[PDB]
């Protein structure tokens, strides 16, 4: 009592129920689909740019004086130098893509400026040096050198003003006041790490004394230490520290130095894979070149596993400065940053919302006020009134956060 | 058999992977184990290659 | 529509041009007469509707005093959209600017 | 011509054009008001063969300079008779003339063919309002300009005031030193201040109660 | 000046897809002869239309001398290079695909405004010099990954998840259409929304959903499509993927089970799990890169969520966490009555009782139900569907998972 289908079972199948219109209404939408195939194989429109230029200025330009640049003009490398010798050249340089020569220089140049860790013109026959070049100065430091004033208001970060009063102390008194240090017999401490909570205020309160400094400041990109090749993000890390400290009252800002982070004077360190070329080489040059300097520099990281007792032996980095959470008064000053600047209403009170935010950051912090926007949007409204906080927070914290089973109370009033 | 003897005594032709390419009798190949290369069309085949 | 939103002149789409003057240094560059008949609109299209102007026409009035023959006549069309559907007293407001005996003016204004 | 066709406006009899067209045999300048009375007969319908002979006879035969005013005024038939089957040739419209017209087309494209969406809908929605600046932030200018800037001016022929204004406003900032303020200054403002004409009134796009013409046409039409 | 460089000169290409989403008695009737053959006509005619382009086009062009001797002047087989820096002395430094570096001539022709660090130029082969610079292209393992067709239906086809379809509306569709809103209040909108829950519940139906209906850019990612193992590979690609959502337009990014990139972040020293560590940070630094995000929109799908890099969790990079549970009795009336509609229901069905005796089965499960009791009708040889093959395809389909519960223990 199965049964299969036989071949003509299968006819009664396929012929009942409109049998006008069933093939009439496929084909037509078989071919249609065909033929959005068959548009596009005629169409292909795709063209090419190649980016020339209007020819009023190059047609001159295209005359024998290309040919010129063909012929005499030369196809010549770049590469690096490890180091020279005495009363004859015998230098020592790698392509490190290529293997590593042992070449000369040609007539062309004179031998004084032919320094180590320099690029230098290198023939493709006969690997000689053409002409000494500069390191590319310098879009490898001022273009994380911005020079420009951040908008981060001092009023931004408000209610963690203490955890701000320790790196006030640490970076702004040696740099306009290095005189009490005469006057009392003492020399200010350089550094600081910063460790905690993600969303805490760390690049806040990195950026709002990068706002007041009115001087160099530098922030660094983690993964931009982390390079492709072998031995290029050590190169790197060399012309940071080296062109950085030149110029006088500058600072320089880690963040993220989980990447090149870990105990290397503990159990680990068996790496070695072009993280350790940028994390040996900096710890190198941190010290060495650093007793009494004016350049601060800070780290900063969510993960307080890569902490170095190397950079904690006094002498490269000082201080734990971590940051912690509002009690009351630092969240209900936030609350009001964060509504300020939008369209609320005059009478709602704040310290009833930040009794519901126990242990939050500002991030959460402003999540909920653009939250609460978000359900006057809802409704036709264009500001917002108190429930619309309320039903934010009950939204944000009282939902995702370390408390549910709302209804089962009855144990507490 | 000097038909196959002398095609023998040629240097092979590479491959080159091209999904997609412009128009206008160039097209634009990277090849196995190198970088992209414009080149241009032989005149037994088509720009219609793609 | 005076209960929804609509005060008599808005006038303000081109003072919504107002942020444009410190976007790149200064201002006050633009002084193409041809500008002026793309003035006559922020008179003309907004007061569509019982826009009606007893001297908030003065841009016009100036301006259909002072050049440009066909925005003369430009100037005088618009006073038909300033009293659209209209039938109650749409001409005595043509009247009083009718009589200045001027080819643009009236040709404009019975228009 | 165009008041013959107003005269003899919206009848798929086909007589209409017995009528002109055979009154007017003449030089082909003359010949350019074939392709109005012609189509003024046919405001909207399906009638997808009187579409082929709109595209069939004159389509580009690249044309030297004689006879583009008139494959420019049989696409601007081509405009309507897509504005009211009710959406169904409006995405084929857009379909074709975003295709084979400004990405594959000459005089009839890259001068004219963008007052099929100031005549399509003037609702407004993304699709068409930003496929028109792919070709006004390109300017191109070497043409001259004020007919890809006719196309600026009445892209904002879409009534119902809506977050236009980012796209009028920056032009605008652009459209002051260049895109020179001695030609199309008035223009740019023309068209920033019509979406805000007033708050409300904006019906006037041949559509009421669902789908009938209340014409309307007539007066739209001849700018 | 005010308007340096006039932001990038670029353009978007859409979809073009949706054709004509109007095919609306969705049965054998002739209203649907007659769309489709109205289809059927707009397309023969742009096809007759582009192939009279073509045809009647008398050109046969002689090219200028100075345009044909440059193509000369130039090498055949023209090499793709990078720019690295620049000196403005008509000589710079570019890199080759394997990375060596050369002090080439750049040529007068080449329109020496372009010249950006990282723009794409090409190069000869005697003396490797810059021919002219390329246009922004980019390889083709991203090419595929952007959208071309509109997958499937609009959100009629979903079966009711209203609660959480006006959240994602809100937060995608409602600032590009209408971001009016937001400016009358100063709040900017958000920006991931990560959408998670037990499979089987519709997450990649509000995907497929919203890139039918709209005007974006739709890329699709999948998780271990950015894996790759050329040391370099895999944060090679963010950098590119995120280029083109931001050359193009106001964008949607929707990549799917991010469960399969990102986990809690251990670092061993092995050279296996860097490659993924390494990309994992760089997408998480693309993300928040603040440089010109240019309105694009990341949507985030996984089945778990307590498995999530906590950096990745926390608002400031997504802001919208969005639970889709196993609904109600409610909602499944609405999606028997979807996946029951193009089939002919007979008379003696109650589809409540199967509602009524369960309580956790899924939006795939009622599926699997609609078309086994189908299958259960050509077994005994019918068209109409009794109530007894919804009673067979329930004990058939269903009894593979239930396992553990204490009967008799409670009441
Ligand atoms: N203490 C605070 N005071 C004021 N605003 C705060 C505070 N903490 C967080 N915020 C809000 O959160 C954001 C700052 O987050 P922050 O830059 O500290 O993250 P982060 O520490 O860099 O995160 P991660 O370490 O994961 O990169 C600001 O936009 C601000 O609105
Ligand atoms: N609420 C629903 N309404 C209608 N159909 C549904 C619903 N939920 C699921 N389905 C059906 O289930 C199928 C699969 O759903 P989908 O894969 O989107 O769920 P998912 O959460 O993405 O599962 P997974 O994460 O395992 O891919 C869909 O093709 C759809 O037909
Ligand atoms: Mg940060
Ligand atoms: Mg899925």
Request: hydrophobic share 35%.
């Amino acid at each position: 009592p199965i049964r299969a289908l036989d071949e003509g079972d299968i006819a009664l199948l396929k012929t009942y129920g409109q049998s006008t219109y069933s093939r009439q209404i496929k084909q037509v939408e078989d071919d249609i689909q065909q033929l959005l195939k068959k548009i596009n194989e005629l169409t292909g429109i795709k063209e090419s740019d190649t980016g020339l230029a209007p020819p009023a200025l190059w047609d001159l330009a295209a005359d024998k004086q290309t040919l010129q640049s063909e012929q005499p003009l030369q196809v010549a490398r770049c590469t690096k130098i490890i180091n020279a010798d005495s009363e004859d050249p015998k230098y020592i340089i790698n392509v490190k893509q290529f293997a590593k020569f042992v070449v000369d220089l040609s007539d062309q140049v004179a031998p004084t400026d032919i320094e180590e860790g320099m690029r230098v013109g290198v023939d493709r026959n006969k690997y000689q040096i053409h002409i000494p070049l500069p390191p590319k100065i310098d879009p490898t430091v001022t273009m994380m050198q911005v020079e420009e004033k951040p908008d981060v208001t001092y009023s931004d970060v408000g209610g963690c003003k203490e955890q701000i009063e320790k790196l006030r102390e640490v970076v702004e008194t040696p740099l306009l006041h290095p005189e009490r240090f005469v006057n009392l017999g003492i020399e200010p401490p350089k550094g600081v790490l910063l460790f905690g909570p993600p969303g805490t205020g760390k690049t806040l309160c990195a950026r709002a004394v990068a706002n007041r400094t009115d001087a160099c400041f530098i922030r660094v990109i983690g993964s931009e230490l982390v390079q492709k090749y072998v031995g290029e993000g050590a190169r790197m890390v060399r012309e940071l520290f080296e062109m950085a400290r030149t110029k006088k009252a500058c600072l320089i800002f880690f963040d993220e130095i989980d990447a090149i982070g870990g105990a290397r004077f503990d159990d680990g360190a068996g790496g070695d894979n072009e993280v350790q070329r940028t994390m040996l080489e900096l710890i190198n040059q941190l010290d060495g070149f650093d007793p009494r300097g004016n350049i601060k520099v800070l780290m900063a990281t969510n993960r307080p596993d890569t902490l170095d007792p190397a950079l904690m032996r006094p002498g490269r980095l000082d201080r734990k400065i971590e940051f912690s959470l509002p009690d009351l008064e630092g969240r209900t000053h936030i609350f009001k940053i964060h509504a300020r600047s939008m369209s609320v209403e005059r009478d709602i009170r704040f310290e009833l919302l930040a009794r519901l935010c126990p242990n939050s950051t500002g991030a959460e912090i402003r999540s909920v006020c653009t939250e609460a926007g978000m359900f006057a949007i809802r409704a036709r409204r264009k500001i917002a009134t108190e429930k619309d906080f309320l039903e934010a927070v009950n939204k944000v914290i009282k939902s995702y956060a370390k408390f549910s089973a709302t209804p089962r109370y009855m144990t507490y009033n | 058999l000097r038909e196959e003897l002398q095609l023998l005594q040629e240097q092979g032709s590479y491959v080159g992977e091209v999904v997609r390419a412009m128009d206008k009798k160039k097209v634009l190949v990277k090849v196995h184990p190198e970088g992209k290369f414009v080149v241009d069309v032989d005149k037994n085949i088509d720009i219609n290659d793609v | 529509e005076l209960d929804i939103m609509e005060p008599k002149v808005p006038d303000d789409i081109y003072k919504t041009h107002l942020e444009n003057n410190r976007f790149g240094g200064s201002g006050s560059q633009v002084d193409s007469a041809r500008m002026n008949l793309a003035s006559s609109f922020v008179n003309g299209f907004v007061n569509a509707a019982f826009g009606q102007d007893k001297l908030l026409t003065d841009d016009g009035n100036k301006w259909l005093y002072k050049n440009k023959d066909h925005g003369m006549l430009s100037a005088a069309a618009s006073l038909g959209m300033i009293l659209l559907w209209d039938v109650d007293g749409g001409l005595t407001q043509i009247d009083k600017y009718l009589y200045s005996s001027e080819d643009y003016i009236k040709s404009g204004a019975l228009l | 011509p165009l008041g013959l066709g107003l005269n003899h406006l919206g009848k798929g009899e086909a007589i209409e054009a017995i009528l002109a067209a055979l009154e007017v045999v003449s030089e082909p300048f003359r010949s350019f008001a074939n392709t109005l009375v012609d189509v003024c007969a046919y405001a909207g319908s399906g009638n997808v063969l009187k579409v082929q002979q709109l595209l069939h006879i004159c389509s580009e035969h690249f044309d030297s300079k004689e006879k583009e005013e008139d494959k420019d005024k049989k696409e601007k038939k081509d405009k309507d008779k897509k504005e009211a089957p009710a959406d169904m040739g409006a995405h084929q419209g857009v379909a074709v003339l975003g295709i084979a017209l400004i990405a594959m087309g000459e005089e009839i494209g890259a001068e004219m063919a963008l007052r099929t969406f100031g005549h399509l809908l003037r609702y407004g929605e993304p699709t068409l309002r930003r496929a028109v600046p792919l070709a006004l932030a390109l300017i191109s200018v070497s043409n001259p300009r004020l007919n890809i800037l006719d196309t600026l001016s009445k892209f904002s022929h879409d009534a119902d005031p809506e977050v236009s204004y980012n796209s009028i406003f920056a032009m605008g900032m652009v459209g002051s030193g260049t895109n020179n303020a001695r030609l199309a200054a008035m223009l740019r403002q023309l068209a920033q201040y019509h979406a805000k004409d007033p708050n409300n009134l904006f019906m006037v796009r041949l559509a009421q109660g669902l789908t009938h013409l209340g014409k309307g046409t007539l007066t739209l039409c001849p700018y | 000046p005010t308007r340096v460089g006039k932001k990038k000169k670029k353009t978007k290409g859409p979809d073009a897809a949706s054709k004509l989403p109007l095919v609306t008695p969705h049965t054998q009737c002739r209203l649907k002869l007659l769309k489709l053959e109205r289809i059927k006509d707009y397309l023969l005619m742009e096809e007759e239309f582009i192939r009279n382009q073509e045809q009647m086009k008398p050109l046969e062009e002689k090219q200028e001398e100075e345009r044909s001797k440059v193509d000369d002047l130039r090498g055949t087989p023209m090499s793709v290079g990078t720019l690295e820096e620049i000196i403005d002395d008509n000589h710079a430094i570019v890199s080759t695909s394997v990375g060596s570096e050369h002090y080439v001539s750049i040529l007068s022709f080449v329109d020496k405004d372009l010249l950006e660090p990282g723009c794409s130029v090409l190069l000869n082969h005697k003396v490797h010099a810059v021919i002219g610079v390329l246009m922004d292209d980019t390889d083709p393992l991203v090419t595929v990954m952007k959208v071309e067709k509109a997958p499937q239906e609009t959100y009629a086809d979903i079966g009711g998840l209203d609660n959480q379809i006006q959240e994602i509306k809100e937060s995608v569709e409602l600032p590009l259409t209408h971001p009016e809103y937001y400016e009358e209040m100063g709040i900017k909108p958000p920006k991931g929304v990560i959408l998670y829950g037990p499979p089987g519940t519709g997450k990649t139906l509000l995907a497929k959903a919203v890139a039918n209906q709209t005007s974006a850019t739709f890329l699709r990612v999948v998780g271990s499509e950015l894996i790759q193992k050329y040391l370099g590979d895999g944060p090679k690609l963010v950098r590119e993927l995120f280029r083109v959502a931001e050359e193009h337009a106001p964008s949607i990014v929707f990549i799917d089970e991010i469960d399969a990139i990102g986990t809690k972040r251990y670092d061993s020293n092995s050279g296996g799990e860097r490659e993924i560590q390494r990309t994992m940070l760089e997408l998480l630094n693309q993300l928040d890169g603040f440089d010109s995000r240019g309105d694009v929109k990341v949507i985030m799908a996984t089945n778990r969520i307590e498995t999530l890099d906590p950096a990745l969790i926390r608002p400031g990079r997504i802001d919208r966490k969005i639970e889709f549970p196993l609904p109600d009795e409610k909602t499944k009336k609405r999606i028997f009555q979807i996946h029951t509609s193009r089939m002919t229901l007979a008379d003696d069905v109650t589809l409540d009782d199967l509602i009524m005796a369960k309580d956790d089965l899924s939006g795939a499960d009622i599926k699997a139900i609609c078309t086994e009791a189908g299958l259960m009708a050509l077994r005994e040889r019918r068209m109409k569907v009794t109530n007894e093959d919804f009673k067979k395809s329930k004990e058939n389909v269903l009894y593979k998972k239930q396992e553990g519960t204490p009967e008799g223990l409670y009441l």
